Amino acid sequence: AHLKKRNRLKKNEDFQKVFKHGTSVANRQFVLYTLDQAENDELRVGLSVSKKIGNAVMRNRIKRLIRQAFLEEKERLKEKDYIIIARKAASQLTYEETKKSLQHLWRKSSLYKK
Template identity: 35%
Template sequence: MKSSESMKSNTNFKNVYHNGKSYANTYLIMYVLKNETEKNKIGISVSKKVGNSVIRHRLTRLIRESYRMNENMFNSGLDIVVIARAGARGKSYNEINSALIHLAKMHKILKEMIKS
């Protein structure tokens, strides 16, 4: 079951920017704000400063796929905005995935995994 949806409206992005908390690393910036639903909303932003449209779309796909593969690890009820930095240009899936997980740990939005 999909527990996330895409954030599309500019108003939602602005709300998360102004009211959410942000952390950054070399490749990504992540803003997080609690919402009042059971679903997560994820928004991805890649500026023209990062590169041409091919590079920007590739980064968007890498971030979206990284989130999708780790979606079950994230807590529910969050608005998440991920912004790619210029340093992310040309990086592999594993590097982007590692950066996304790193930021999620900084925000403390990962579920506690039960160790068996």
């Protein structure tokens, strides 16, 4: 299906809080930010995509691939606030490549239950 509204990070303040007071990891295609939520009975994902990737269709495409990867792995992951930044290198990735890159970041950040 699609990643639910519950599982998406919206408010501008919510993003800023993650960047400022939260833990960070990065690889070649992605930067992953994690912020612990006491009150999160559920996982939330927010996305930032560089203007460097210049096709709105492409930015949308990568964004969708990231959401799907999160949706698939959701049960496995701890309930927290995530922000994913997509680098220019992330631009041509397939879903399996995107999933693999994120999975590597998730493992590195110890975000896997249980």
